Design a protein around this nucleic acid. Sequence first.
RNA 1: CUCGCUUCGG
Lengths: 1105, 46, 49, 65, 34
Amino acid sequence: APIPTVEEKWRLLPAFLKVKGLVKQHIDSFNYFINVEIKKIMKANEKVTSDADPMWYLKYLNIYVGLPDVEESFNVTRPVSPHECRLRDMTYSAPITVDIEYTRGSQRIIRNALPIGRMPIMLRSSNCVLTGKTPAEFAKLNECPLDPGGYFIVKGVEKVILIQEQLSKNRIIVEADRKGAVGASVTSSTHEKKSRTNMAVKQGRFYLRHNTLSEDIPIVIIFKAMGVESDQEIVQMIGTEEHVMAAFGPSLEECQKAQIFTQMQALKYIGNKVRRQRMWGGGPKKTKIEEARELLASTILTHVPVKEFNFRAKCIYTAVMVRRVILAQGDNKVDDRDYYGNKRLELAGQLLSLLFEDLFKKFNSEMKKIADQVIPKQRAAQFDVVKHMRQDQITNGMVNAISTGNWSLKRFKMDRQGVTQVLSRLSYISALGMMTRISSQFEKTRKVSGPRSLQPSQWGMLCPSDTPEGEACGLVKNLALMTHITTDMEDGPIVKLASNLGVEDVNLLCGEELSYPNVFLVFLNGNILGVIRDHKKLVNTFRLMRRAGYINEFVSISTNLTDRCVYISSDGGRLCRPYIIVKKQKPAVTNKHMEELAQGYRNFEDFLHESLVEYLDVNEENDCNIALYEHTINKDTTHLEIEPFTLLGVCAGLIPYPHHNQSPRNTYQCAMGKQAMGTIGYNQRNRIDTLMYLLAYPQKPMVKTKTIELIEFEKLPAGQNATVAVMSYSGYDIEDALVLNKASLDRGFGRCLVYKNAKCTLKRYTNQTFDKVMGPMLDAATRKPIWRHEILDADGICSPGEKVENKQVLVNKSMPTVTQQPQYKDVPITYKGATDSYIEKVMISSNAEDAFLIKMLLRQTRRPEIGDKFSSRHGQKGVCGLIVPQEDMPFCDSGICPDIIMNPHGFPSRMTVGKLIELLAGKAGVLDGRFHYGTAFGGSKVKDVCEDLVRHGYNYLGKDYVTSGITGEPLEAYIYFGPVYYQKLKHMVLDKMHARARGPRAVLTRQPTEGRSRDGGLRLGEMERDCLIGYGASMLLLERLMISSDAFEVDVCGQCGLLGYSGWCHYCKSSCHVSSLRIPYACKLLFQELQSMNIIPRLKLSKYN
Amino acid sequence: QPMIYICGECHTENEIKSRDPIRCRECGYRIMYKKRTKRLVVFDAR
Amino acid sequence: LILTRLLVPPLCIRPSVVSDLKSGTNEDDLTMKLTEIIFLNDVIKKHRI
Amino acid sequence: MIIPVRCFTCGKIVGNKWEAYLGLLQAEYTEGDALDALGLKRYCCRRMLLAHVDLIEKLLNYAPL
Amino acid sequence: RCPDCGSTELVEDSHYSQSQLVCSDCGCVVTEGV
RNA sequence: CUCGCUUCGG
Ligand SMILES: Nc1ncnc2c1ncn2[C@@H]1O[C@H](COP(=O)(O)OP(=O)(O)OP(=O)(O)O)C[C@H]1O
Ligand SMILES: [Zn+2]
Ligand SMILES: [Zn+2]
Ligand SMILES: [Zn+2]
């Protein structure tokens, strides 16, 4: 009697994606920031006034961001589409306006709409013009309907703010030190101050360490300073277990050795151990005891609040910390940092909130300083802020922070880099997967261990396979398909319910109750909410209330039985995942519910409200029992997995039968497919990017995952299905190489288009002179333009439709040299390129600064050749090793000759059975005209496709009788034929091929330049020199490192040992002893640098004999 | 000499001479492409 | 061991780039450090006077 | 972008069988029987027509016009 | 002027990323390298 | 051009 199974359960996943999922994270965060958070920030800084001349003030009333507009029109705005901002290399922003009231001459003057800044507007956000638009309207706006959005456009480039990952704040962390001592640390961070305070056990006794104290001080002294003076009360708070007293005894003895027995004595000791903050201006009576008390009340343990100098809660918190340290000092239950229950994700909204708070505070400070400088000295012409409210402050700050990606917040002492990245437009999958990336707080700057590892906590939250192959392996991660990031809650009703649920106040009882076996501490965002007995009832009631709806569904409650702590988390940034609630071995979701969902009676929110599906946090799912499938459900199951294949991410969703492959193959395929060549969007023709790759005839895959259907990948395919035959042929496919069919390439297979951009600017300078373009310089001999100016039109700009060759001018730009007649020097925009290119379009625009922007879209049509990289959607990246004629290819009885011959030897080492199953399924599907599914942990089974193949008259395993094309005789072994979805990669031999003549050299050290773009030469690294030394080839090493790179001839004086010039020594004022000498130029630079450093190298020359 | 351009939404032939602010009649749109050349171009079917 | 004269290096060690696109030049750190040192020498002489 | 004129592997003319194929889809025909009626015996031409996406009209929606 | 043949047909022709002022008559490389 | 930063490739 198998348990009934809800087959349509997977239909819950699309409905969720109707409201949340892939891209809605950034969009929701930005909408919350621009609709709620900015008003909160302004309310926090609503009134600004100067100390000089009281009764003068500037009061903010309301703030608006409006719709995106362009300031091109003279003092006039105009609605602008995002594509227009892309083309004109401008920013897609909206005017930050505010209404204010202030006092000019003690008379209140109010403005109802006064611009102060510009917000770069995230695409598809609430204020973005693209929102709520139909595909026809998208076409009218020249935007692809399938574009994920969620990215900013600044100065014409698309920047994406990556989701930051960081450790949660205000949490006790017990960890071992370098010396093995098990200490504690808590980074108490409030809205104003972040301070990490530590507890050490360096000598068997506990010291508290803080940045504001000269030396770490015993914990008992701090306890005495915080109000509790009796040692017995301290010991009761620490714990009543015998080993706890045995461990804590030395601290008591150390305290008793000193004469500290009152609060005043401990405060005096701390004040002695206090350090002045660089002579803090203003002295309130030789402060010391007051300084110590203020540090205890405010600086130390900021997140723990003291009502009115009542340190009872802080005493309980530090006692709990001491108890945890003591308990962890025995059994090595050291907490791990990589556990994602302690991790938080910052989206674009929180970062933009911090940046706008900093910028607004700077703006208000500047306004106050201007008021102080102007008001008390000027005139009866009363100073008013409107004449001084510079509007470029906020706009420039936002633009620079988003564009450069480096964020410097002095108010928070936060120096972040690489926050924003250029959106990659290699393919639709590239942009979609980059849209869901997560960066780590630690960087590939060093070989760390642990974060780089795949922790089990990533289940359902982050994609296990998708990670960049290389130095950043494991430090850049991708969100799973079905995941959600929580926002902040009000935190009020949680406290109210917890108080009403029997949680005793901590102040009402002494610390001894903390040591009882049945007493459980209840926390709330790192603050001790209280104590409770019978925590099962409390947890069940809290979960029931959350299901009922009286508590926000993202509030998490978890239990730690080892520490006996009930954690209630309500802060934002936590990862959550929906799960079907299971009550007594039967899921809450039935077939009727899914039928209603399919018919449209109910949506996902209806499932949420009816206690059928609930969000689980990582900490909460630590305590739950989850069943992958219905048949796995047992008596002790609290939740059911909605769909296992949601475990994989977006890129990993492209893999057909990914569960049949080895994980490194899946990771390689994720990386490869991020770089797959294919269509970008429906507006890919009007779009002008710096580099674009298109496929001539893209085809949707024959074996498509449900993830492909969900993300509509089949609408924008990035590959072609080729009749692959798996066999060894001609020995030209030895290591990962593959053989291509010449006829297939002649018929358009793999045909690709490469679009490059060439942009020029004609700017007007400070002097009233401007860059101008000459017409083509006609040759008087032939009355035709010279070969260099052949392609230019009458206006000096190359016309679309013609072909450009190497060293030909596209724009005949000439610019003035003055900044009396103007003098123009020619700086034409030549086309550097190995092959010919065709101009597809020329775009001419004008900015507000009268700068003429010209963009040429050069197009090249490339055919696959030797060296072109090819992938097979399974991590089997390969290089086209040989292109054989069609007749040489083996053929089946039906006459089918394969396009791609791939070597069998790649399979056994990599065990990519998924590729074989995909080939079989694709063959069956194309035979019966169906699209088989290679969904993770599911999909079409082998038996069904085998039955389809035998029904259609082919072999039930794909292996087919094959006649050799060369000899005309049948092959001894059957050949594995079938359609495989091969995708071409952007790595081409034409772009990568490099050759270097003498070429240019660097000015500082006269050696060839670095890169191919700069015509640089290759580099003989240190190991190459080591290998040459090991060979013993002295002459070749000398020729390579001296003759061919930086050979030079200097003049050395044999008397003084210094370098002369032109056969003359200035130091000796003579020319008799000057001799020429061959030397590397870098050595001469080193000698001159050493001479400048007063380290004089004197060369004692001698004859070569 | 008539230099002719095509705006991005009107798609109308606009004749503008040098040093003119880029605009279009019966619109206000400011992306102004250039028309295709009249010279013959030879292509290879390969 | 105590320096009273500084050997300012030749121009080859300190290349200067004339970025005519703007009203400025790209100079390495050595030139700016030497400028600051000469400015300090002048300031000290002025203060002594 | 547009339907290729020739089949990649065999080389049978498949460009002229696209729009008529759509007619069979505008009719009641399934994919397999429509492909059979079009005369595509070997599976390579069936893959050519079945896996092709018609992006030309979507791109033309963004054409200047 | 060309130092070899004395002609004034000095053309600035870069050959594979090598800037080069060369006589257009006798091909004498007047100046090279930037 | 110099410099840094990112993303790649291997
Ligand atoms: N950081 C690096 N340093 C030196 N060589 C590298 C580096 N990254 C890649 N390579 C080159 O690539 C080669 C690594 O391939 P290897 O690790 O042996 O196979 P693989 O990448 O595991 O492929 P499979 O996943 O086994 O299919 C060897 C090395 O010459
Ligand atoms: Zn000398
Ligand atoms: Zn127009
Ligand atoms: Zn065919």
